[PDB]
């Protein structure tokens, strides 16, 4: 359904999340304490049943899940029969 024959030349690399990052030598702030000293405002997971018109949890989870399934090609070749 809704098919065209499309050429997609470049897909970005795998979203395994682990890629050797860009290396530097010097850094801007030479002050590592800032890492341990930093606080933030609280993240509250829930307020009052967590209702939203944009359904955020469901929708975002599924959207991540989709390209994840795409890249693993549905995890369908990896598991044999134990």
């Amino acid at each position: 359904m809704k098919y065209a024959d499309l050429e997609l030349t470049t897909r970005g690399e795998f979203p395994h999340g682990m890629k050797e990052p860009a290396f530097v030598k010097k850094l801007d702030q030479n002050i590592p304490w800032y890492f341990s000293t930093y606080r933030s405002m609280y993240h509250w997971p829930i307020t009052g049943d967590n209702w939203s018109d944009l359904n955020e949890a469901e929708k975002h989870h599924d959207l991540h899940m989709f390209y994840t399934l795409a890249w693993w090609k549905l995890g369908e070749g990896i598991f044999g029969v134990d």
Partner: protein, 40 residues
Amino acid sequence: KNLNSWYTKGTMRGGVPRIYYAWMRPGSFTRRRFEKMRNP
């Protein structure tokens, strides 16, 4: 009547993670030596 809330207790260290236990300590989790009867 306990005005300190367990909801907010702690100190953000920024990036530093620490572990917490849902219930008991993980070592106490699998009891199989008394269950499957391996003991002297």
